[PDB]
């Protein structure tokens, strides 16, 4: 369904090279996330099947009001907007990490990433 494919476009990058500032600047443009510039956007790396599994008891627990939190940790990169303007050119600073993630699930699929844990 459409919301799951959208989640993948905004939040999934299987095998990144360097996860530096330039990686952020370039993937944000590539994925169509720069008019206007998103203030922060996080990408998850690794196995697509582990991500889907957060929606079942296999790799997730219930979390807060309507969310799920993963049991396994993932490689992630947060891209944060540097500077005052929300209009291109968008300068980004990258922060690489390794921890569990929080999603919303609908009909068995992740449709939303909770980004409050990367702020």
Curated annotation (Swiss-Prot):
* A Gene Ontology BP annotation from the UniProt entry: antimicrobial humoral immune response mediated by antimicrobial peptide
Q: Result of mutating residue 52 to R?
A: Found in a patient with Parkinson disease; uncertain significance
Motif Nucleolar localization signal residues? 29-33
| Reported effect, residue 101 to I | In ALS9; uncertain significance
Q: What is the effect of changing residue 115 to A/G?
A: Strongly increased ribonuclease activity
Q: Please give one Gene Ontology molecular function term for this protein.
A: actin binding
Effect listed in the UniProt record for changing residue 44 to V? In ALS9; uncertain significance; reduced ribonucleolytic activity; moderate reduction of thermal stability
Question: Which cysteines form disulfides?
Answer: 24-79, 37-90, 55-105
- Tissues/organs with expression: Expressed predominantly in the liver. Also detected in endothelial cells and spinal cord neurons.
Q: Where is the active site?
A: 11, 112
**Modulation of this protein's activity:** Has weak tRNA ribonuclease activity by itself due to partial autoinhibition by its C-terminus (residues 140-147), which folds into a short alpha-helix that partially occludes the substrate-binding site. In absence of stress, the ribonuclease activity is inhibited by RNH1 in the cytoplasm. In response to stress, dissociates from RNH1 in the cytoplasm and associates with cytoplasmic ribosomes with vacant A-sites: ribosomes directly activate the tRNA ribonuclease activity of ANG by refolding the C-terminal alpha-helix.
What happens when you mutate residue 38 to I? Answer: In ALS9; reduced ribonucleolytic activity; low angiogenic activity; reduced mitogenic activity; moderate reduction of thermal stability
Gene Ontology cellular component terms for the protein in this record: actin cytoskeleton; angiogenin-PRI complex; basement membrane; chromosome; cytoplasm; cytoplasmic stress granule; cytosol; endocytic vesicle
Q: What is the effect of changing residue 114 to N/H/S/A?
A: Strongly increased ribonuclease activity
Summarize the impact of residue 119 to C.
Found in a patient with Parkinson disease
- Per the UniProt record, which EC number(s) apply here? 3.1.27.-
Q: Where in the cell is it found?
A: Secreted; Nucleus; Nucleus, Nucleolus; Cytoplasm, Stress granule
Q: Which keywords accompany this UniProt record?
A: Amyotrophic lateral sclerosis, Angiogenesis, Cytoplasm, Developmental protein, Differentiation, Disease variant, Disulfide bond, DNA-binding, Endonuclease, Hydrolase, Neurodegeneration, Nuclease, Nucleus, Protein synthesis inhibitor, Pyrrolidone carboxylic acid, Secreted, Signal, Stress response
Function (record text)? Secreted ribonuclease that can either promote or restrict cell proliferation of target cells, depending on the context. Endocytosed in target cells via its receptor PLXNB2 and translocates to the cytoplasm or nucleus. Under stress conditions, localizes to the cytoplasm and promotes the assembly of stress granules (SGs): specifically cleaves a subset of tRNAs within anticodon loops to produce tRNA-derived stress-induced fragments (tiRNAs), resulting in translation repression and inhibition of cell proliferation. tiRNas also prevent formation of apoptosome, thereby promoting cell survival.
Quaternary structure and partners: Homodimer. Interacts with RNH1; inhibiting ANG ribonuclease activity. Interacts with PCNA.
Noted disease association is: Amyotrophic lateral sclerosis 9: A neurodegenerative disorder affecting upper motor neurons in the brain and lower motor neurons in the brain stem and spinal cord, resulting in fatal paralysis. Sensory abnormalities are absent. The pathologic hallmarks of the disease include pallor of the corticospinal tract due to loss of motor neurons, presence of ubiquitin-positive inclusions within surviving motor neurons, and deposition of pathologic aggregates. The etiology of amyotrophic lateral sclerosis is likely to be multifactorial, involving both genetic and environmental factors.
The entry's protein name is Angiogenin
Q: Which residues of the full protein are shown?
A: 27 to 145 of 147
């Amino acid at each position: 369904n459409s919301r799951y494919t959208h989640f993948l476009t905004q939040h999934y990058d299987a095998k990144p090279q360097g996860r530096d500032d330039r990686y952020c600047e370039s993937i944000m443009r590539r994925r169509g996330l720069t008019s206007p510039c998103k203030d922060i956007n996080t990408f998850i790396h690794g196995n697509k099947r582990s991500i889907k599994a957060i929606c079942e008891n296999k790799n997730g627990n219930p979390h807060r009001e309507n969310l799920r939190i993963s049991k396994s940790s993932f490689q992630v990169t947060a891209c944060k907007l540097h500077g005052g303007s929300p209009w291109p050119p968008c300068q980004y600073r990258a922060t690489a990490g390794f921890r569990n993630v929080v999603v919303a699930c609908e009909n068995g699929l992740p449709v939303h990433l909770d980004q409050s844990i990367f702020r």
